[PDB]
Write a protein that binds this ligand. Sequence first.
Ligand SMILES: C=C[C@H]1CN2CC[C@H]1C[C@H]2[C@H](O)c1ccnc2ccc(OC)cc12
Ligand SMILES: C=C[C@H]1CN2CC[C@H]1C[C@H]2[C@H](O)c1ccnc2ccc(OC)cc12
Ligand SMILES: C=C[C@H]1CN2CC[C@H]1C[C@H]2[C@H](O)c1ccnc2ccc(OC)cc12
Ligand SMILES: C=C[C@H]1CN2CC[C@H]1C[C@H]2[C@H](O)c1ccnc2ccc(OC)cc12
Ligand SMILES: C=C[C@H]1CN2CC[C@H]1C[C@H]2[C@H](O)c1ccnc2ccc(OC)cc12
Ligand SMILES: C=C[C@H]1CN2CC[C@H]1C[C@H]2[C@H](O)c1ccnc2ccc(OC)cc12
Lengths: 242, 242, 242, 242, 242, 242
Amino acid sequence: LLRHLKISKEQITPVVLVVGDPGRVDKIKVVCDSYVDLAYNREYKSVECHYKGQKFLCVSHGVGSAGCAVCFEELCQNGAKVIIRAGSCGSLQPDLIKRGDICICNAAVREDRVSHLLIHGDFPAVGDFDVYDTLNKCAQELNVPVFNGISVSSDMYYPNKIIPSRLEDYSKANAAVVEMELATLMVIGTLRKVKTGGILIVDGCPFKWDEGDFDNNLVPHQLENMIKIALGACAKLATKYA
Amino acid sequence: LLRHLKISKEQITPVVLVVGDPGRVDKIKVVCDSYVDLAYNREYKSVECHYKGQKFLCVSHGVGSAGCAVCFEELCQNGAKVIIRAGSCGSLQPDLIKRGDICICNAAVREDRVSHLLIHGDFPAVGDFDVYDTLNKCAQELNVPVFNGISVSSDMYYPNKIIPSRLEDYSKANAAVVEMELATLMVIGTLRKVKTGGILIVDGCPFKWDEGDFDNNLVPHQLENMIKIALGACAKLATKYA
Amino acid sequence: LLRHLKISKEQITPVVLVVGDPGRVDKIKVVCDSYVDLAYNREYKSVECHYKGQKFLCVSHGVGSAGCAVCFEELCQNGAKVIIRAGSCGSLQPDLIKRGDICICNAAVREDRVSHLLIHGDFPAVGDFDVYDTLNKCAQELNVPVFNGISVSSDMYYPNKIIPSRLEDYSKANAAVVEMELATLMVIGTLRKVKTGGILIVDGCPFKWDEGDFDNNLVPHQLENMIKIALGACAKLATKYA
Amino acid sequence: LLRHLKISKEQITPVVLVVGDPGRVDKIKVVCDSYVDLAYNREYKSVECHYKGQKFLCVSHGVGSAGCAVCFEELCQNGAKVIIRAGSCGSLQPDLIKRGDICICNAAVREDRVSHLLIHGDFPAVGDFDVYDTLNKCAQELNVPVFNGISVSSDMYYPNKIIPSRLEDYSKANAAVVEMELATLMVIGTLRKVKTGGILIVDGCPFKWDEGDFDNNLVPHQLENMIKIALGACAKLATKYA
Amino acid sequence: LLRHLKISKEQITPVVLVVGDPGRVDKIKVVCDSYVDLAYNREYKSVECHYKGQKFLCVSHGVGSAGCAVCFEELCQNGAKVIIRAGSCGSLQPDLIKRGDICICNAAVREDRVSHLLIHGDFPAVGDFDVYDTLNKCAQELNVPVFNGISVSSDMYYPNKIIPSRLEDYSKANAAVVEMELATLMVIGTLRKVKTGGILIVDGCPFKWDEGDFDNNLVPHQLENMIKIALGACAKLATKYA
Amino acid sequence: LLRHLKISKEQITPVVLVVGDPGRVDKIKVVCDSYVDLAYNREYKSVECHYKGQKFLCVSHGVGSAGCAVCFEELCQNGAKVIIRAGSCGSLQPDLIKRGDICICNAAVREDRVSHLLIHGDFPAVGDFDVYDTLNKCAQELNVPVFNGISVSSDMYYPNKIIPSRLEDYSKANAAVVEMELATLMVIGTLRKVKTGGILIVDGCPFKWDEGDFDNNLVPHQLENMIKIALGACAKLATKYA
Ligand SMILES: C=C[C@H]1CN2CC[C@H]1C[C@H]2[C@H](O)c1ccnc2ccc(OC)cc12
Ligand SMILES: C=C[C@H]1CN2CC[C@H]1C[C@H]2[C@H](O)c1ccnc2ccc(OC)cc12
Ligand SMILES: C=C[C@H]1CN2CC[C@H]1C[C@H]2[C@H](O)c1ccnc2ccc(OC)cc12
Ligand SMILES: C=C[C@H]1CN2CC[C@H]1C[C@H]2[C@H](O)c1ccnc2ccc(OC)cc12
Ligand SMILES: C=C[C@H]1CN2CC[C@H]1C[C@H]2[C@H](O)c1ccnc2ccc(OC)cc12
Ligand SMILES: C=C[C@H]1CN2CC[C@H]1C[C@H]2[C@H](O)c1ccnc2ccc(OC)cc12
């Protein structure tokens, strides 16, 4: 079995959907055509999903870059060819990107440490074009409007008052949203020859937390739509390996 | 309630025992005199422990620095005065520190990113003396031999072959062991005026993974002893606030 | 007029093709349907191209990031909406990417300085999806095989023997090719809300310069094909603004 | 003889008290039971102290990290097992830590360069627990109140107005005091398997130098008390090797 | 021939005058006693100048550090012993250094990337004394007042509003002027055992661009004087090798 | 009085000769025409020298950058206009620069920390031309051969085996010699509008310490010659202010 995911090597499928919360895996599996529970160790919950005639895993990665890298590395080392992250994020453009909007991301800010322990900082955190295109084409089929943009993947959720957060700089640089894992996924994927992407639902705006605008309200219909897009994309991408 | 731990603010006790695996919380609570299950959200499982006449929380932090910082910040922001981490680690001194040995750590290598987003790199990751002394005195009472030393807290579990891992440098520098969260705990604690410490059980040696010497075997009697020391210390420290 | 390009502000078109060598501008204009010479100052030669019913500039940027940034900034500040770089590059994968092969790049290594004087290093150098897709679809129409991949954009052409070149690290990281300007273009474009891309012809392999495998032979038919793809893409993208 | 200290190798004792000013060595020796003058070269004055039945050296290190490292390295290379620094420092918490207060430090900010030329910045500057405990227990025996905390060891005494001093950041981070050598001592000690500590007398507050609150007044009774604590600790620690 | 300069190796003279603009080479050659056009490739224009009985090349380097390094390396690799840059620059001391003033520079700020890819940042960008002395003595002979000082060689011409430009810091540090290539020249020269210098004409002040005080007016008589000084110096230095 | 030098402000002369060892001040004063002892505090010994009709101070700075900066700042803040350092150094070119050779330095490697706490790393550590010229012209008058070159000013005297020393890199970069203070002097001088220089006697070669080639033998006649050159230069420079 995989060292920490505890799934057997034979159970790794070419396409894998990753999400942060183990609870979310259980909410996703029930919208599929069927599923098989595989393993649950620590924050890493794994389920084989069957959807639109195809088979792909759904696996939880936990909160944050160092914990997710364990997950991503084990998947890449054991046969995953495509990894899509579906997650939540905060808006960095509060005039234009609002609660419940959906972002399909192509690139990310490497505000982690593990990516830098693997490759020099100059190297880009970028997703695969094809995966990105597939996500966007599924959103278009379902008539679900989306945003595209760069995510800031930051290891600091709660800022302090000594070293300024770089969020406002990145907003000024036209980064769309903020989350905690996509850059890490993208860099590990490039290093390991695994295609990656990301789709995110907006939940709040960090620049408006002092007015209670937190990440505490996933708009249920929007969340459903994102999950449909994510599952759709997985199934289409899975067709090529099947 | 706490934003992500989902425990009420009134339920935060002055002493908190933190561990990585939510499963471990359930294995610890049953050795206490009694417990009350509080919350379980994502990888964060919280239980109020009653032991030796005192009351303290036990909370899981997940794998890795960015995820644990969410936990630690919420505890520090909402009344925790003392936080002890009990965890596993890898030996960096394989001639002297073997499987199942126990290390009580006073300081850590800041091979994360969140600590650096809070305070300049020059700042030390150090535990509180008193907590460290309390842990050591509990180990002495129970006649459990221990090691003391510095932990390397690294965000990279799986190294690649491009950028060398710094583990061998840190071994040469006399770091004892390697894990993934203690530096983060220590720096947040200093910033927030919360006393911190760490006790760790050795599980393998990264320098001998090519010969199967992994972190996959917690020596059961040694693990029990460490948990007894950790609970003992918590109860003693809790007496001062009670 | 533009401060250093010396073209009038009214002459900036929404799509601009950029190339390094002022000589190349003169070789490109003659394959268009017609052209108007605009300005030539320093290494910056500007010509208005007419191709497939559309109008776009072709402008030389010179060798290297700091010099090209002057060009790119003036174009972005004065109305350019899309900038495609067509250039030469060296292979970083000599088993697979050979002389005369064509690469359509989506992202780049920021081994410059100007990008870092504009935005933190963690920020990705990424092209626009749409531009990348347009280039690839033009190559497919013309039946011209291409490679896709990340470019290392390095400010050092001639390495010395004291500080190792990072080319081999980036090859190991799966970077495809090496050139000198694309990262700079990409970052300025993101900062300025200008869509960017890159198409490159392989000319040699730096890892085989000790055996004379230099950047001194642009395969003439391959160069023609790349230029056709680049012009094709420009014309298609120009249609949206016209 | 030692290369720069000029003391013979046979004269190095297991415990060594270090101080900045060669003049201070002469003021310390006369409070001991007896002494033997050993060497005086450059700013490095060495005297063998006899106190409470034990024998330990007292050696001056000069002002600043690079000069003190020469001293510390020679002592560590030639048999020193324990090194305590006794020095002066500035308050970083002027509401709570006043002129003449005494701080027993456990850790330090590495705002030097030599420590970084020996080991990566992430590594902590931490003292030995036992030494720290011994100092604190001697202060308690003598009924001398003390502070405990982190020292900022900075190579810049006189700030200029271009690059902000980091003192206010470190004050906000709960650093207690500022001096110039302790981090250097601590890191060399960890690297060389030598136990280290630090005791410091407060002399001024850098944040109030514009109002004349300089380091120009060592409160004589407080200085005596600190020196008594330092000598006491040395003698107790020396007992273990004797 | 030289790889990118396209001049033959036999045509490299011991002294070389370098300038940014290929147009400037043509304006310089006509003030010499005679000249021979050698090559023009990309932005690199080369002419053999005959002046005061001596022979030296004049070669254009283009805008910016990465492009100029190609030029400088090829000259240093193929026999150049002395390289003087004559260029334009911006004032960083607008009270004292005005439009058209002439600066003979001895050292430079390394705000590039190629110098850092060749040697650690701590290493100084410094010119040769002798070259500097020769320039100053030629200015004195011709009765042309000059300034001496440090140049900031920055790869960013157009600053943005996210990361502050360091120009004001360097002004406060007593840097005289700003340009884009001298540091690069100086470091390559030291690495290659080639003597270097720099003479610059002031054209504007970046701190007053918001009031139109741009680099768009080379005072014609002052420019003539600088070029006379530069040619004078070249001829004197050339005498030693002839 | 000066805060730490303890000399009165009225006693600061426009030219100051600085040396590391307080003992050396006493050996220099006796070769002057006469002297007046001024102050001796810590490692800082100050004497007013009278030589060739002029008056200048000689002041000891101690070992290392952070300690010397206190000295240099106080001199620059209180009227010093010219500061020459005379010191010892190690050869980085053992084939060409031998024991007892004399180097007159124009620039330095900033391998300290205080310079970086005052100004960005890109800024050069360079001496004043005039001072350098004066030193060289005094050596020529006295028929004393000298070397000129860049000094590596490093805060680490005793390297360890974890992080490689940069000495060999700097040797390859054509640095001549190694010492511990000149860069610091040069940067403080530029910041404070004080002219600086450096003259150094070679004592050993760090690359040959494993064969006993230490800094433990100042060739007495060569040392005399250097001191004569240094005093000569001071007197000439002092004439301009007198
Ligand atoms: C327990 C942690 C959770 C908190 N937020 C939702 C999912 C988990 C990670 C995080 C997310 O990255 C995110 C969403 C929305 N707004 C955010 C704002 C800031 C941010 O900083 C890293 C992360 C945000
Ligand atoms: C799913 C992750 C787990 C893997 N190891 C056990 C607990 C979790 C974190 C990690 C631990 O830090 C650790 C223990 C033992 N040897 C290790 C060796 C290397 C190491 O690198 C960060 C971490 C080690
Ligand atoms: C005068 C400079 C030219 C030299 N090469 C061709 C175009 C200009 C820039 C460079 C190009 O980036 C490139 C092409 C092919 N192989 C290369 C290998 C190394 C490289 O390093 C920056 C650049 C390469
Ligand atoms: C000649 C130098 C002396 C000056 N101060 C007293 C002892 C020597 C070092 C320094 C000390 O670290 C110190 C004490 C008190 N207040 C300080 C404030 C600032 C500081 O910055 C490094 C050092 C301070
Ligand atoms: C096309 C580029 C040109 C623009 N300026 C004149 C010559 C070329 C380079 C630059 C010069 O370095 C310079 C001169 C005057 N003022 C300047 C102000 C700022 C500056 O920033 C690098 C460069 C300046
Ligand atoms: C107590 C310290 C002394 C030791 N050496 C002589 C004077 C003082 C400083 C040092 C000098 O910088 C120096 C001279 C000769 N060879 C050296 C080799 C290495 C070096 O590293 C900083 C310094 C050297």
